[PDB]
Design a protein around this ligand. Structure first.
Ligand SMILES: C[S@@+](CC[C@H](N)C(=O)[O-])C[C@H]1O[C@@H](n2cnc3c(N)ncnc32)[C@H](O)[C@@H]1O
Ligand SMILES: Nc1csc2nccnc12
Ligand SMILES: Nc1csc2nccnc12
Ligand code: NA
Length: 256
């Protein structure tokens, strides 16, 4: 039994009150107050549509993924990763795909900096899309489940779906459940072929063990995964630590 599976069993036993106190304990988060108020008013400039823009920003500012050329954003939801990439000088086109419909986020139209190079398309299930030529492949798909075997299936499905899109390109891919042994086996195979490394984002909630496979890095996947399991298990042992609260991103305005 992995450290991650022990964390999962403990998470599943939490009452709603305990879960609500645990999920943000000691994490980092952006203050969404101003963006939520502006989005409620129908403002289309400056605001990030979701917490996703700051989340991807964290990796990009650390050179973990360096978006460039034609960017594909799989599972774009409202479009946070797409609108953030649209403002980056090396980026020339952003194509976002998302499922939409009941239970799923629809793309939000915005006029943030670089909006003219963005096309967000809903009604697109990526498990039925043929791969396209691109210079950057982003993917933020992985639905949490109380069942780690359901999450293992969903993670493996994402890893097999993204591979044909990977052609010596920059990438940032969510790995919903990176601790299940079958997932580690696929990740090690993928890293041997395409390189990169698995990284824990400090903006991720403690309620998910997600890590992101990024193109610009090296390291031992197993070691990185167990470090997150230990961190997340340690966060059950202490009173809630209020999160580090940072300013949200300003995505500006205008065409590129
Ligand atoms: C974690 S959210 C992405 C948030 C986004 N990165 C942002 O910055 O706003 C993942 C999205 O993937 C979508 N999704 C889930 N399964 C999908 C699939 N089979 N095909 C396409 N989109 C999918 C969900 O509806 C959801 O909006
Ligand atoms: N998704 C959930 C809603 S309540 C709950 N409690 C334990 C595990 N998962 C859940
Ligand atoms: N109470 C909970 C324990 S685990 C979980 N996952 C999602 C929503 N609620 C819960
Ligand atoms: Na929804």
């Amino acid at each position: 039994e992995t450290l991650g599976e022990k964390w999962k069993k403990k998470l599943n036993q939490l009452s709603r009150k305990e879960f609500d106190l645990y999920k943000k304990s000691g994490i980092t988060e952006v203050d969404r107050t101003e963006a939520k108020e502006g989005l409620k008013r129908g403002e289309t400039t400056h605001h990030a549509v979701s917490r996703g823009s700051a989340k991807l920003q964290w990796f990009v500012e650390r050179n973990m993924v360096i978006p460039e050329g034609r960017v594909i954003d799989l599972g774009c939801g409202r479009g946070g990763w797409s609108y953030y990439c649209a403002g980056l000088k090396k980026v020339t086109e952003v194509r976002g795909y998302t499922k939409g419909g009941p239970g799923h986020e629809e793309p939000v139209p915005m006029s943030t900096y670089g909006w003219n190079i963005v096309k967000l398309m809903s009604g697109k299930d990526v498990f039925y899309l043929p791969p396209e030529k691109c210079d950057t492949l982003l993917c933020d798909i992985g639905e949490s489940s109380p069942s780690p075997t359901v999450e293992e299936s969903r993670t493996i499905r994402v890893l097999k779906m993204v591979e044909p899109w990977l052609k010596n390109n920059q990438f940032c891919i969510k790995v919903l459940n990176p601790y299940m042994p079958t997932v580690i086996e696929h990740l090690e195979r993928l890293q041997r072929k395409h390189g990169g490394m698995l990284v824990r984002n400090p903006l991720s909630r403690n309620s998910t063990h997600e890590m992101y496979w990024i193109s610009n890095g090296t390291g031992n996947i197993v070691s990185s995964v167990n470090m997150v399991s230990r961190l997340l298990l340690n966060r059950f042992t202490m009173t809630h630590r209020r999160p580090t609260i940072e300013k949200d991103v300003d995505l500006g305005a205008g065409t590129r």
